[PDB]
Amino acid sequence: SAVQQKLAALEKSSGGRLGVALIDTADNTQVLYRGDERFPMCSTSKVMAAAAVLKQSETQKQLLNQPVEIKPADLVNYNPIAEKHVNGTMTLAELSAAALQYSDNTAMNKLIAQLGGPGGVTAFARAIGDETFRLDRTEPTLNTAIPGDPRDTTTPRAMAQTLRQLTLGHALGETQRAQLVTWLKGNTTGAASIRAGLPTSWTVGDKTGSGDYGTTNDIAVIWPQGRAPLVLVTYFTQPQQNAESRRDVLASAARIIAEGL
Ligand SMILES: *[B@@]1([O])O[C][C]([C][O])O1
Numbered sequence: 001s002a003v004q005q006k007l008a009a010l011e012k013s014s015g016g017r018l019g020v021a022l023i024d025t026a027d028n029t030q031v032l033y034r035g036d037e038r039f040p041m042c043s044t045s046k047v048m049a050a051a052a053v054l055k056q057s058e059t060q061k062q063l064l065n066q067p068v069e070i071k072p073a074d075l076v077n078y079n080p081i082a083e084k085h086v087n088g089t090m091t092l093a094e095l096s097a098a099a100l101q102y103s104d105n106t107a108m109n110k111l112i113a114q115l116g117g118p119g120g121v122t123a124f125a126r127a128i129g130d131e132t133f134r135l136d137r138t139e140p141t142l143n144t145a146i147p148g149d150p151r152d153t154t155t156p157r158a159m160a161q162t163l164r165q166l167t168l169g170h171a172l173g174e175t176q177r178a179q180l181v182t183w184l185k186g187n188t189t190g191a192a193s194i195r196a197g198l199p200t201s202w203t204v205g206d207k208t209g210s211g212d213y214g215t216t217n218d219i220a221v222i223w224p225q226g227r228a229p230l231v232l233v234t235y236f237t238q239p240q241q242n243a244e245s246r247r248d249v250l251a252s253a254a255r256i257i258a259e260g261l
Helices: 002-014 042-056 092-101 105-114 118-127 156-167 174-185 247-259
Strands: 017-024 029-033 067-070 088-091 203-211 215-223 230-237
Touching (some): 002 029, 017 156, 029 156, 042 092, 042 174, 042 215, 067 105, 088 092, 092 174, 156 230, 174 203, 215 247
Antiparallel strands (some): 067 088, 203 215, 215 230
């Protein structure tokens, strides 16, 4: 299609490897580019950890209000919110929000611990029908994004389907789904990524990711004004370990997708 030709051209111009999956929930049509290739998730994996904790809260009704102590040893490489609460506590809701809206890595590690390790996050993916997602490591090493390494990867197709189920479907209870959507819509890290390629009037909830090898990711639910929502996953990684982030590629891919509608 026109869109696949434009995405291939964008990829060629960028020097890296681009993966895209769009689900249009109007007709459940899909647009895929490298849709079944594995990409390092980096921080887009935080959506799965937060959703797994939300799923737990369907039975443990007060779980999100449980205080979790932030100790100095807990701090890793990027902890914008957790740093503000060292030697104090954050609730699981606050940690989930921090992981999602600020990409706080300490928050992610506390969520992983709550789930019993990376295998607990992966188990939740399996439980909602995602056979592709795998979380193997904690922060910060899950961002190494080594070419060919299957650890901490998923495919665009799988992540788009899972994000659809979590936000628009019923993998979560009604209050939990609404909470997740609220958290994603409040993301603070996404302005230069998918959002930048879309009409300013569209509502977007997204989670970015970045890692080594210039890995630059964003996964989004998009609510166009007067139109069924869309789920868009854009993964990008580069051949040089020290490559710079390329959020503009994700913006451009979103723009190309949006043109085709
Ligand atoms: B994710 O990818 O988003 C930011 C943090 C930095 O390590 O991880």
